[PDB]
Short mmCIF file of C-alpha atoms and ligand atoms in Angstrom, two decimals:
data_model
loop_
_atom_site.label_atom_id
_atom_site.label_comp_id
_atom_site.label_asym_id
_atom_site.label_seq_id
_atom_site.Cartn_x
_atom_site.Cartn_y
_atom_site.Cartn_z
CA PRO A 1 127.46 105.60 115.01
CA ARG A 2 124.63 107.93 114.02
CA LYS A 3 122.19 107.62 111.13
CA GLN A 4 123.76 108.65 107.82
CA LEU A 5 123.30 107.91 104.07
CA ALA A 6 126.55 106.07 103.23
CA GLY B 1 132.68 79.22 112.35
CA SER B 2 134.00 82.05 110.18
CA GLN B 3 134.38 79.43 107.44
CA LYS B 4 132.68 79.65 104.01
CA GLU B 5 130.57 76.49 103.53
CA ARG B 6 127.62 76.17 101.15
CA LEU B 7 124.27 75.35 102.89
CA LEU B 8 121.89 76.05 100.01
CA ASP B 9 121.71 73.17 97.52
CA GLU B 10 121.51 75.94 94.88
CA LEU B 11 121.47 79.74 94.74
CA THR B 12 117.76 80.11 93.91
CA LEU B 13 114.41 80.77 95.62
CA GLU B 14 113.89 77.00 95.65
CA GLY B 15 117.28 76.51 97.29
CA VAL B 16 116.16 78.89 100.03
CA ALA B 17 112.74 77.17 100.33
CA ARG B 18 114.43 73.77 100.78
CA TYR B 19 116.86 75.22 103.31
CA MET B 20 113.96 76.75 105.28
CA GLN B 21 112.24 73.35 105.26
CA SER B 22 115.36 71.84 106.86
CA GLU B 23 116.40 71.41 110.50
CA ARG B 24 119.43 73.72 110.21
CA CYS B 25 117.02 76.64 109.67
CA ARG B 26 115.24 77.60 112.89
CA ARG B 27 116.06 81.29 113.36
CA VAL B 28 115.29 83.93 110.67
CA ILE B 29 116.15 87.64 110.75
CA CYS B 30 114.37 90.02 108.41
CA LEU B 31 115.91 93.36 107.38
CA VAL B 32 113.38 95.64 105.71
CA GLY B 33 112.98 99.14 104.32
CA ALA B 34 110.76 101.46 102.35
CA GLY B 35 110.34 99.01 99.48
CA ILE B 36 108.02 96.85 101.61
CA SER B 37 105.56 99.74 102.20
CA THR B 38 105.68 101.28 98.69
CA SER B 39 102.67 99.18 97.70
CA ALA B 40 100.96 100.38 100.88
CA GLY B 41 100.95 103.94 99.53
CA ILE B 42 104.13 105.14 101.30
CA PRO B 43 106.94 106.35 98.97
CA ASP B 44 110.55 105.35 99.44
CA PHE B 45 113.44 107.74 98.63
CA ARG B 46 115.39 106.14 95.78
CA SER B 47 112.62 105.20 93.32
CA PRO B 48 112.86 107.52 90.26
CA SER B 49 109.17 108.28 89.82
CA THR B 50 107.29 107.99 93.08
CA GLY B 51 110.27 108.35 95.42
CA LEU B 52 110.36 111.23 97.92
CA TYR B 53 113.94 112.29 97.06
CA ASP B 54 112.51 113.94 93.90
CA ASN B 55 108.82 114.51 94.53
CA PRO B 56 116.60 116.68 99.84
CA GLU B 57 117.68 114.88 103.03
CA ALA B 58 117.58 118.26 104.89
CA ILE B 59 113.92 117.56 105.90
CA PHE B 60 115.20 114.52 107.85
CA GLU B 61 118.48 115.96 109.28
CA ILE B 62 118.21 116.81 113.00
CA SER B 63 120.03 120.14 112.71
CA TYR B 64 117.45 121.27 110.14
CA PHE B 65 114.59 119.81 112.15
CA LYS B 66 116.07 121.49 115.21
CA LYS B 67 115.91 124.88 113.44
CA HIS B 68 112.79 124.47 111.28
CA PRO B 69 110.35 121.64 112.36
CA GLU B 70 107.40 122.95 110.32
CA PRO B 71 108.36 121.48 106.86
CA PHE B 72 108.60 117.96 108.27
CA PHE B 73 105.16 118.08 109.98
CA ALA B 74 103.79 119.47 106.70
CA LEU B 75 105.38 116.59 104.77
CA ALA B 76 103.96 114.05 107.23
CA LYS B 77 100.41 115.40 106.72
CA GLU B 78 101.00 114.91 102.96
CA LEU B 79 102.23 111.33 103.21
CA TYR B 80 100.00 110.35 106.15
CA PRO B 81 97.96 107.61 104.38
CA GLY B 82 94.16 107.39 104.49
CA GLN B 83 94.30 103.92 106.04
CA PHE B 84 97.02 101.59 107.32
CA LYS B 85 97.05 98.28 105.43
CA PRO B 86 100.24 96.20 105.56
CA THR B 87 101.47 94.42 102.46
CA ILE B 88 101.96 90.80 101.56
CA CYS B 89 105.58 91.13 102.71
CA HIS B 90 104.48 92.44 106.12
CA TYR B 91 102.11 89.47 106.53
CA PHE B 92 104.85 87.08 105.31
CA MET B 93 106.86 88.22 108.32
CA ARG B 94 103.68 87.53 110.33
CA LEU B 95 103.53 83.92 109.15
CA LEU B 96 107.20 83.51 110.16
CA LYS B 97 106.46 84.70 113.67
CA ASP B 98 103.37 82.50 113.93
CA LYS B 99 105.38 79.44 112.86
CA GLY B 100 108.00 80.42 115.45
CA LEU B 101 110.62 81.04 112.72
CA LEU B 102 111.01 84.78 113.23
CA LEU B 103 113.87 85.69 115.60
CA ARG B 104 113.65 89.42 114.86
CA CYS B 105 112.54 91.96 112.26
CA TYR B 106 115.01 94.85 112.01
CA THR B 107 113.26 97.71 110.18
CA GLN B 108 114.30 101.11 108.83
CA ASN B 109 110.61 102.00 108.50
CA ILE B 110 108.82 104.38 110.81
CA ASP B 111 105.31 103.59 109.53
CA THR B 112 104.23 100.95 112.16
CA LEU B 113 102.92 98.59 109.46
CA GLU B 114 104.95 95.77 111.11
CA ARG B 115 102.93 96.21 114.36
CA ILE B 116 99.60 96.50 112.50
CA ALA B 117 100.39 93.21 110.71
CA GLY B 118 100.85 91.92 114.28
CA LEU B 119 104.59 91.81 114.86
CA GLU B 120 105.15 92.50 118.54
CA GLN B 121 107.71 94.76 120.23
CA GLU B 122 109.69 91.65 121.18
CA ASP B 123 109.93 90.68 117.50
CA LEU B 124 110.73 94.20 116.33
CA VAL B 125 113.86 96.36 116.28
CA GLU B 126 112.63 99.64 114.84
CA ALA B 127 116.14 100.94 114.09
CA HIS B 128 114.95 104.38 112.90
CA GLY B 129 112.22 104.69 115.54
CA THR B 130 108.56 105.16 114.79
CA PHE B 131 105.44 107.32 114.64
CA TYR B 132 103.68 104.86 116.96
CA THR B 133 104.56 106.89 120.06
CA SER B 134 105.74 110.52 120.36
CA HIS B 135 107.53 112.32 123.24
CA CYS B 136 108.12 115.82 124.51
CA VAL B 137 111.63 117.06 123.73
CA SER B 138 111.95 118.67 127.16
CA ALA B 139 114.10 116.29 129.22
CA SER B 140 112.30 117.26 132.47
CA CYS B 141 108.88 116.45 130.93
CA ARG B 142 109.19 113.69 128.28
CA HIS B 143 105.39 113.14 128.27
CA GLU B 144 104.47 110.33 125.85
CA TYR B 145 101.85 110.84 123.13
CA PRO B 146 100.10 108.26 120.87
CA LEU B 147 99.69 108.26 117.10
CA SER B 148 95.98 109.28 117.42
CA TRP B 149 97.04 112.52 119.13
CA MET B 150 99.99 113.14 116.77
CA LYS B 151 97.65 112.66 113.78
CA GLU B 152 95.12 115.16 115.19
CA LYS B 153 97.91 117.80 115.32
CA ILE B 154 99.53 117.01 111.95
CA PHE B 155 96.14 117.03 110.16
CA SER B 156 95.16 120.09 112.18
CA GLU B 157 98.30 121.76 110.74
CA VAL B 158 99.28 123.04 114.23
CA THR B 159 102.85 122.11 115.27
CA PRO B 160 102.46 119.52 118.05
CA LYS B 161 102.99 121.03 121.50
CA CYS B 162 103.10 119.25 124.85
CA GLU B 163 100.06 120.07 126.96
CA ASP B 164 102.06 119.92 130.21
CA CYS B 165 104.99 122.18 129.28
CA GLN B 166 104.33 123.47 125.71
CA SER B 167 107.54 122.04 124.22
CA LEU B 168 107.78 120.55 120.73
CA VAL B 169 106.38 117.00 120.66
CA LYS B 170 108.52 114.81 118.41
CA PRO B 171 107.19 111.63 116.67
CA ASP B 172 109.95 109.35 118.07
CA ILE B 173 111.95 108.73 114.90
CA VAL B 174 115.68 108.76 114.45
CA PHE B 175 116.52 111.67 112.17
CA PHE B 176 119.75 111.60 110.13
CA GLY B 177 122.56 112.76 112.44
CA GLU B 178 120.94 111.28 115.60
CA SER B 179 122.16 108.15 117.40
CA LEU B 180 120.09 104.93 116.96
CA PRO B 181 118.25 103.37 119.89
CA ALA B 182 120.33 101.37 122.37
CA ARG B 183 118.15 98.27 121.89
CA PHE B 184 119.41 98.06 118.27
CA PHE B 185 123.02 97.53 119.32
CA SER B 186 122.26 95.13 122.16
CA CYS B 187 119.85 93.07 119.95
CA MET B 188 122.36 92.85 117.14
CA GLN B 189 124.95 91.78 119.76
CA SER B 190 122.91 88.65 120.46
CA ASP B 191 120.84 87.96 117.36
CA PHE B 192 123.61 87.62 114.76
CA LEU B 193 125.28 84.91 116.87
CA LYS B 194 122.36 82.59 116.21
CA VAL B 195 120.74 83.57 112.90
CA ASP B 196 120.21 80.72 110.39
CA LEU B 197 118.79 82.80 107.51
CA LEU B 198 119.13 86.42 106.64
CA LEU B 199 116.15 87.72 104.68
CA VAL B 200 116.48 91.22 103.23
CA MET B 201 113.57 93.08 101.68
CA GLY B 202 112.83 96.50 100.16
CA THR B 203 116.06 98.29 101.20
CA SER B 204 118.91 99.88 99.17
CA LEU B 205 121.27 99.15 102.08
CA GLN B 206 122.58 102.73 101.77
CA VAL B 207 121.77 103.98 105.29
CA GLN B 208 124.39 103.15 107.94
CA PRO B 209 124.83 101.65 110.45
CA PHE B 210 121.68 99.64 109.60
CA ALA B 211 123.28 98.49 106.32
CA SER B 212 126.32 97.00 108.02
CA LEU B 213 124.01 94.46 109.72
CA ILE B 214 124.46 92.04 106.80
CA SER B 215 128.16 91.62 107.59
CA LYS B 216 127.27 90.66 111.17
CA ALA B 217 125.69 87.37 110.13
CA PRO B 218 128.05 84.38 110.32
CA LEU B 219 129.81 83.86 107.02
CA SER B 220 127.85 80.67 106.25
CA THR B 221 124.44 82.23 106.98
CA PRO B 222 122.42 82.24 103.72
CA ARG B 223 121.13 85.68 102.71
CA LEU B 224 118.14 86.23 100.44
CA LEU B 225 117.40 89.66 98.95
CA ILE B 226 113.88 90.49 97.67
CA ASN B 227 114.06 93.89 95.95
CA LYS B 228 113.55 95.67 92.61
CA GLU B 229 117.38 96.02 92.29
CA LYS B 230 120.46 94.19 93.53
CA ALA B 231 121.72 95.87 96.68
CA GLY B 232 124.48 95.36 99.24
CA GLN B 233 127.25 94.32 96.81
CA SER B 234 130.71 95.62 97.79
CA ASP B 235 131.51 98.83 95.89
CA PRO B 236 134.54 98.57 93.53
CA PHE B 237 136.05 101.79 94.91
CA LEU B 238 135.07 101.98 98.62
CA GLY B 239 135.97 98.24 98.87
CA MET B 240 139.43 99.10 97.48
CA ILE B 241 140.29 100.13 101.05
CA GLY B 242 133.78 93.38 104.31
CA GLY B 243 131.12 90.73 103.96
CA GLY B 244 129.18 92.40 101.09
CA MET B 245 126.64 90.57 98.96
CA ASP B 246 127.90 88.25 96.20
CA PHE B 247 125.15 86.72 94.09
CA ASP B 248 127.15 86.38 90.88
CA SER B 249 130.93 85.75 91.03
CA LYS B 250 132.34 82.20 90.91
CA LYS B 251 132.79 82.72 94.68
CA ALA B 252 129.04 82.95 95.31
CA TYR B 253 128.08 80.38 97.91
CA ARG B 254 125.11 81.61 99.99
CA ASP B 255 123.61 84.86 98.58
CA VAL B 256 120.44 84.87 96.47
CA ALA B 257 118.67 87.71 94.65
CA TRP B 258 115.06 87.68 93.54
CA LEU B 259 114.51 90.91 91.66
CA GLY B 260 110.97 92.26 91.48
CA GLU B 261 108.16 93.46 93.73
CA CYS B 262 108.48 92.23 97.32
CA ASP B 263 104.80 91.30 97.29
CA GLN B 264 105.36 88.94 94.31
CA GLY B 265 108.69 87.64 95.63
CA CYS B 266 107.26 86.80 99.11
CA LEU B 267 104.19 85.31 97.47
CA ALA B 268 106.57 83.12 95.41
CA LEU B 269 108.58 82.03 98.47
CA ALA B 270 105.37 81.29 100.39
CA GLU B 271 104.17 79.05 97.58
CA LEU B 272 107.37 76.98 97.59
CA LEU B 273 106.88 76.54 101.32
CA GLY B 274 103.21 75.45 100.99
CA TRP B 275 102.07 78.63 102.80
CA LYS B 276 100.43 80.29 99.83
CA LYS B 277 96.81 79.60 100.90
CA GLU B 278 97.72 80.62 104.43
CA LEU B 279 99.13 83.88 103.10
CA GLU B 280 96.18 84.74 100.90
CA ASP B 281 93.71 84.08 103.77
CA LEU B 282 95.69 86.18 106.28
CA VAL B 283 96.11 89.23 104.08
CA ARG B 284 92.49 89.01 102.97
CA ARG B 285 91.09 88.46 106.50
CA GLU B 286 93.30 91.22 107.97
CA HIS B 287 92.51 93.72 105.19
CA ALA B 288 88.77 93.00 105.50
CA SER B 289 89.08 93.47 109.26
CA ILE B 290 90.89 96.80 108.69
CA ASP B 291 88.15 97.78 106.23
CA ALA B 292 85.44 97.01 108.79
CA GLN B 293 86.80 99.01 111.74
N1 LIG C 1 108.33 103.68 104.85
C1 LIG C 1 109.19 104.40 105.54
O1 LIG C 1 109.24 104.35 106.80
C2 LIG C 1 110.21 105.17 104.81
C3 LIG C 1 110.02 105.69 103.54
C4 LIG C 1 111.07 106.35 102.88
C5 LIG C 1 112.27 106.51 103.51
N2 LIG C 1 112.46 106.03 104.77
C6 LIG C 1 113.73 106.22 105.50
O2 LIG C 1 114.77 106.62 104.59
C7 LIG C 1 115.73 105.54 104.50
C8 LIG C 1 115.38 104.74 103.27
O3 LIG C 1 116.15 103.51 103.25
P1 LIG C 1 115.59 102.36 102.30
O4 LIG C 1 116.78 101.63 101.76
O5 LIG C 1 114.46 101.66 103.00
O6 LIG C 1 114.84 103.13 101.17
P2 LIG C 1 115.55 103.55 99.84
O7 LIG C 1 114.65 104.33 98.93
O8 LIG C 1 116.85 104.11 100.21
O9 LIG C 1 115.72 102.05 99.25
C9 LIG C 1 114.53 101.42 98.76
C10 LIG C 1 114.88 100.14 97.99
O10 LIG C 1 113.67 99.36 97.81
C11 LIG C 1 113.40 99.14 96.43
N3 LIG C 1 111.97 99.09 96.28
C12 LIG C 1 111.03 100.08 96.45
N4 LIG C 1 109.79 99.71 96.31
C13 LIG C 1 109.91 98.36 96.12
C14 LIG C 1 108.94 97.32 95.93
N5 LIG C 1 107.65 97.53 95.94
N6 LIG C 1 109.39 96.08 95.76
C15 LIG C 1 110.71 95.85 95.75
N7 LIG C 1 111.72 96.71 95.93
C16 LIG C 1 111.23 97.95 96.08
C17 LIG C 1 114.13 100.27 95.71
O11 LIG C 1 114.27 99.89 94.36
C18 LIG C 1 115.39 100.36 96.53
O12 LIG C 1 116.28 99.24 96.25
C19 LIG C 1 115.65 104.82 105.84
O13 LIG C 1 116.36 105.46 106.91
C20 LIG C 1 114.16 104.94 106.22
O14 LIG C 1 113.91 105.21 107.58
C21 LIG C 1 111.42 105.37 105.40
C1 LIG C 2 115.20 108.48 108.80
O1 LIG C 2 115.23 107.63 107.90
C2 LIG C 2 114.05 109.49 108.77
C3 LIG C 2 112.75 108.81 108.45
C4 LIG C 2 111.80 109.73 107.71
C5 LIG C 2 111.50 109.29 106.30
C6 LIG C 2 110.10 108.84 106.09
C7 LIG C 2 109.10 109.92 105.95
C8 LIG C 2 107.84 109.76 106.78
C9 LIG C 2 106.60 109.44 105.94
C10 LIG C 2 105.51 108.69 106.70
C11 LIG C 2 104.30 109.49 107.03
C12 LIG C 2 103.52 109.03 108.28
C13 LIG C 2 103.44 107.51 108.40
C14 LIG C 2 102.90 107.08 109.75
ZN1 LIG C 3 106.33 118.36 127.73
#
């Protein structure tokens, strides 16, 4: 998984 | 094992202080974010007044960095503080290390205050990277550059370019869209097997996968949140389709919430633990030392 606002 | 048993005598700061004084509690993990460096002059995103978000995530997406890197280096000049002084919370994590209680600090922050406060590499999973080092983007070069050099270029207002190959030189942070460092996954693999207390400070727990780290603790690991707002509670809608924070229901058994400034909250915890004088002296001695040099 990659960085993400969530 | 995955069973829900209550280890705190009560769901309070004092409960957590007693628990930390006990034998069961040997191995602490801190999870931290921008809230622990707000009082060090570095704005977070989500705070209404002084938060970056409105004073927007494009400037931290890779695909936008990839195209236009100038706005981010311009922002970093803006927010590059005049001096690097860690906060009471940073030094609280220091005391933990020094008492051999700190297993790891997992941080979203890229500001290096954890290292300045004297957390070592071993102690630190910088999940979103850091400004401490910088590298060339050219895979054949990958020359490494320190923060002193990076600062000279950001303050010079020239886009940093590698002196060997003239590629863009990138501060070493994980932008949104990019994959986290490998050491994050492999540390989490091992650390959450053996954590006795989960301490969570100055984070909204909105950035994944870093936020999902709280659900990796064993189900009976206490979790203390020091923050201006509750965070990490399961959403009523996204939950509809686990291991979120429960401070309040009748099914609360191990999650505590102290709501206020981290600096006050950590100072409160330290006092319960009889570390207050030790904390005052450290912060004061370290800040004076920073002022001298
Ligand atoms: N210091 C930095 O490195 C920095 C600063 C801003 C944003 N970011 C990046 O953006 C994301 C932000 O995630 P985040 O959750 O850390 O920030 P956020 O703004 O998303 O969440 C901050 C949380 O801390 C609280 N808070 C702020 N100041 C506080 C204080 N003094 N005392 C107590 N609580 C306080 C806020 O109310 C909020 O709950 C991360 O990926 C991070 O890398 C980093
Ligand atoms: C992922 O979260 C991207 C991280 C960038 C957000 C923080 C902005 C950087 C501000 C710090 C300035 C320099 C500090 C050494
Ligand atoms: Zn290069």
